[PDB]
Amino acid sequence: ASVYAWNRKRISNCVADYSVLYNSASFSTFKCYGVSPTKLNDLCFTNVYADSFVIRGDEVRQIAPGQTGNIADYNYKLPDDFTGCVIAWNSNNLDSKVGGNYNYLYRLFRKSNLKPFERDISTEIYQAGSTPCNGVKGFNCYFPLQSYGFQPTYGVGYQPYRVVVLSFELLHAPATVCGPKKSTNLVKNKCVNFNFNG
Amino acid sequence: STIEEQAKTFLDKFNHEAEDLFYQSSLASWNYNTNITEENVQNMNNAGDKWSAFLKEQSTLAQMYPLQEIQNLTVKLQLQALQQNGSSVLSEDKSKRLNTILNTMSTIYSTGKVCNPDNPQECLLLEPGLNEIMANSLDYNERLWAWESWRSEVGKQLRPLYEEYVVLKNEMARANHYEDYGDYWRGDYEVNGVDGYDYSRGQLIEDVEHTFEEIKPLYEHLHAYVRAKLMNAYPSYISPIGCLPAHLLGDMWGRFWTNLYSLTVPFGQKPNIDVTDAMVDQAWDAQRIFKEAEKFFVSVGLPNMTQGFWENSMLTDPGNVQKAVCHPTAWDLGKGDFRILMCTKVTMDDFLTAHHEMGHIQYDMAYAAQPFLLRNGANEGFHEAVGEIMSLSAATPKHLKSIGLLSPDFQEDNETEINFLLKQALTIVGTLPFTYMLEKWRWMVFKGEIPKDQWMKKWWEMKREIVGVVEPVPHDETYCDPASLFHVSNDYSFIRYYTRTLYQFQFQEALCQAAKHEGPLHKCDISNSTEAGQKLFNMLRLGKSEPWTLALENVVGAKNMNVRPLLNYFEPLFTWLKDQNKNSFVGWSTDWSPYA
Ligand SMILES: *[C@@H]1O[C@H](CO)[C@@H](O)[C@H](O)[C@H]1NC(C)=O
Ligand SMILES: *[C@@H]1O[C@H](CO)[C@@H](O)[C@H](O)[C@H]1NC(C)=O
Ligand SMILES: *[C@@H]1O[C@H](CO)[C@@H](O)[C@H](O)[C@H]1NC(C)=O
Ligand SMILES: *[C@@H]1O[C@H](CO)[C@@H](O)[C@H](O)[C@H]1NC(C)=O
Ligand SMILES: *[C@@H]1O[C@H](CO)[C@@H](O)[C@H](O)[C@H]1NC(C)=O
Ligand SMILES: *[C@@H]1O[C@H](CO)[C@@H](O)[C@H](O)[C@H]1NC(C)=O
């Protein structure tokens, strides 16, 4: 999806293996905020929010708590008290075509900054001046969503990067997204410490 | 809300769409240059028309925001750059006439073919053949024939066209609140609104004269030495008291004196510093040349080239089937895409050109953080100067010995330094009076100081007074002798070479002082010095955001262009030329003593 209409998938009632993601060499950024990747494979959470979008190479830094920029102010805003991980990888192979891939858009303007975990899919003409836009992109009135013309011959700071942000929250409901539990070779006829089913 | 916020949002939208459109235009131009095919020409024309129409529409829309209600310097600079009418202020008929005149001058200069009367079965063009004839012939009448015939044909074709061109450009410039087209060209160096660092359009001519007055003794001594050597080569044509014949300067127009190095060599017996054979013996590919240049740039602390640079550049001639322009050019296509188009041969000249163009690429990379309309040099001089300093540093014997291209047992005595400095003077010092005289003449033509019926009588008078070059035969007003050069005929500024030449040695002194070099200035290498690279990168990162005076303060510590680094660079050669000119007479006479 585009950064403005970012896809959010709610992940519930399954086993989340984070070691498969962490040990992959296909990811350029695996920056976790509020939790460490080593203990993610053990902890359990009520729900996992997976937000997926595409941004530029130079815009990966803006997906963090306390940062500023066009993406944070007008497209995708993270809370300061954010628990989760930001995973980004280069996607020049798939999301770039020689003519220019214009399928990815970003919200360039808005009157006020976005709230954390807010999606704005409005296509109303931005009013930068006193004059009413009246639906026509004339003087002082511009269109909010602008395309990124992704081409394979771009620089590393302009190549398309797919970003998946995992948000971990704990609520009063029973936590069901738990990390995989590892089981040893059963030993019989000896005085051992057993931990069957917790 | 406010005008400033409206302008900032308008600039943001402009920058965003402009970068994409400029990328498309630049990519089309690249595809034409690396692949000369008719569909590529059509794509280039379509992209250029879209780019020009987009610039016209944004120029039309940017003017509705008044300049005086904006206080931010960067926003005011971008709005000032965008709000220029260009040719749009002029009427559609006159604009079309000017465009037609520019196109026909481009076709006449590019496809101009002149050959000897009575043998017209085949003729030679200037770029494939006449340049080689001017650079290599030792025959007086052959060079005289080529010079007079080419100026006769080109001047007689271009004289009414130039007469229309000056009037149309002056009309456009005065319609744009400038004194003349010369003031429009001098407006590039104009700084307004900065406390202390303001520079005026009228100050540029005074500064150029002030620097040239100190240039003049060194040029007089060099001219006397070249005159004596040409007298040795040609016994009767050159007078001891007069100027040099025009067709004997080694080039078609007198732009460079680098083709007289063989005739004017101080020590022929001593060997040269040619490293071509060493690269041929060790099988140095062009890729190895660019990798060594990249090693040089990482040694000083600048960032290394991107992967896209290596993947997308054409550093070798493609082949017979695919045609490409052979001229080395660095392309900043936009969006972090940097390429070099050079048909690289195994020569010293191509190696220095590779360093120069990679310096251009480094300069382009440095200001990538800046907004799109500020992604340029502070002036036209800096962009060439940062490549020329690399050209200076790479050519040193210390650099060649360090990278293995020169023998470790080569003896660096005074004689090789003298002849190398003389070659550098013929290339660098010799172009300065020609550049100053041409620009001053063009400024006087635009200003109206010289009437149309008196253009040439003054011009030769200037050339004798400044360049010390005499016409072979008198020329009347049917000739158009200046417009035979590429830059003047195709509407290009010419003061960039003068500013580049002074900025080159100013930057060289600043970096060598930063790098703690302990010898002569021409023996200085800026490799291995992190502080020199940091001092350079501080200016490089600014781009066009800051005034050129502030950038010069950042590098050399001065608020104005200076002439002392050039004189310091050539001081051993200056003393040697003063010693060698004891018997001869320094200076020239404007009379017709050699030939007329
Ligand atoms: C150059 O243009 C020709 C024209 O058809 C084309 O066949 C060829 O693939 C092009 N080569 C490159 C490297 O673009
Ligand atoms: C001027 O504008 C730029 C971006 O438009 C901004 O970063 C800078 O802080 C502004 N400067 C002032 C003094 O407002
Ligand atoms: C551009 O030309 C228009 C037409 O006369 C004029 O109103 C405007 O002031 C010009 N722009 C500038 C910056 O002078
Ligand atoms: C540039 O330098 C960095 C660090 O020295 C290196 O990782 C990178 O591969 C270099 N770039 C290229 C194209 O080799
Ligand atoms: C070079 O140095 C030697 C000895 O110092 C001297 O004899 C010779 O004249 C010098 N030549 C030049 C051109 O300075
Ligand atoms: C610069 O550094 C490189 C790498 O250590 C070295 O090989 C080279 O000789 C140095 N240059 C000089 C002039 O010492």
Q: Which amino acid is at B254?
A: G
Q: What is the DSSP letter of B83?
A: T
Instruction: Give Cα separations from B200 to B50, B88, B191 (angstroms).
Output: 35, 25, 7
B463 annotated binding-site participant? yes
Q: Do B9 and A109 touch (CB under 8 A)?
A: yes
> Closest by alpha carbon to B459, among B167, B258, B127, B162?
B162
Mutation test residue for ligand 4: of B287, B304, B312, the one with most atoms within 8 Å of CB: B304
Q: Which helix or strand (DSSP H or E) is residue B208 part of?
A: helix B201-233
**What pairs with residue A8 in β-bridges?**
A51
Q: How far apart are CA A24 and CA A30, in angstroms?
A: 10
Question: Is B67:B80 a contact under the CB 8 Å cutoff?
Answer: yes
What are phi and psi for residue B568, nearest 5 degrees? -65, -35
The secondary structure of residue B438, as a DSSP letter, is: H
Nearest CA in chain A to B62: A139
Judge: A146–B335 Cβ closer than 8 Å, yes or no: no
Q: Are B560 and B547 in contact (CB under 8 A)?
A: no
Q: Is B242 exposed, middle or buried (0-12, 13-18, 19+ CB in 10 A)?
A: buried
Chain B residues in contact with chain A using a Cβ-Cβ cutoff of 8 Å = 1, 5-6, 9-10, 12-13, 16-17, 20, 23-24, 27, 61, 64, 306-308, 311-312, 333, 335-338, 368
**Residues 6 or more apart whose Cβ sits within 8 Å of residue B478:** B155, B156, B159
Q: How far apart are CA B118 and CA B139, in angstroms?
A: 20
Is there a contact between A140 and B6 if contact means CB atoms under 8 Å apart?
yes
CB B319 within 8 A of CB B291: no
- What is the DSSP pairing of strand A47-55 with strand A161-169? antiparallel
**Dist. CA A129–CA B3, nearest whole Å:** 8
Q: Is B361 helix (H, G, I), strand (E, B) or coil?
A: helix
What are B388's two structure tokens?
Answer: 């020329």
> Alpha helices, DSSP H only, in A109-196?
none
Q: Are B250 and B258 in contact (CB under 8 A)?
A: yes
Q: Phi and psi (nearest 5°) for B7?
A: -65, -40
Chain A hits for B27, CB-CB cut-off 8 Å, are 153
Q: Are A110 and A144 in contact (CB under 8 A)?
A: yes
CA distances, B583 to each of B170, B228, B327, B577, B580 (Å): 49, 11, 44, 12, 8
Do the Cβ atoms of B65 and B7 come closer than 8 Å?
yes
Type of residue at B402: S
Nearest beta carbon to residue A153 from set B1, B9, B312: B312
Helix (H), strand (E) at residue B15: helix B3-34
